[PDB]
Amino acid sequence: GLRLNELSPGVGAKKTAQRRGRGIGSGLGKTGGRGVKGQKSRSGSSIR
RNA sequence: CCACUGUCGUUGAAAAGCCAGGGGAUGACUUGUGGAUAGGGGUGAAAGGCUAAUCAAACUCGGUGACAGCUGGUUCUCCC
Numbered sequence: 001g002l003r004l005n006e007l008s009p010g011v012g013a014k015k016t017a018q019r020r021g022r023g024i025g026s027g028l029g030k031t032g033g034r035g036v037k038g039q040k041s042r043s044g045s046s047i048r
Numbered sequence: 049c050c051a052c053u054g055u056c057g058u059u060g061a062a063a064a065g066c067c068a069g070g071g072g073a074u075g076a077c078u079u080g081u082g083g084a085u086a087g088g089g090g091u092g093a094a095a096g097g098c099u100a101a102u103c104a105a106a107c108u109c110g111g112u113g114a115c116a117g118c119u120g121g122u123u124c125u126c127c128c
Contacts, residue, residue: 021122
């Protein structure tokens with residue numbers, strides 16, 4: 001290894017995790033991918 | 049000691065009063081002090097009344113972040 005500065009993970013290795021509800025531009029704002037009023041949009045929903 | 053009528057007051061002087069009238073006023077009366085009955089329990093000349101401005105089940109803490117197919121909200125950017 002050269003240095004603790006120049007260590008890259010090797011493109012494709014990492015990905016940014018998704019963050020719901022952080023504005024219009026991120027693609028996951030407001031509802032956060034959940035849709036509208038319904039059971040599956042709620043805070044403890046699942047598929048059973 | 050009560051509370052029948054009306055006006056006023058209704059961000060009141062007052063979370064139920066004032067004023068003018070009204071009822072009982074030796075009685076199943078009114079009242080002081082202490083005590084007893086405790087929550088699905090009490091107490092009730094019975095209105096589901098009252099049980100500390102809380103009552104078709106008090107209050108406080110705990111189970112407890114109860115559950116909520118419901119309502120609200122959900123935060124930077126650009127490209128397909």
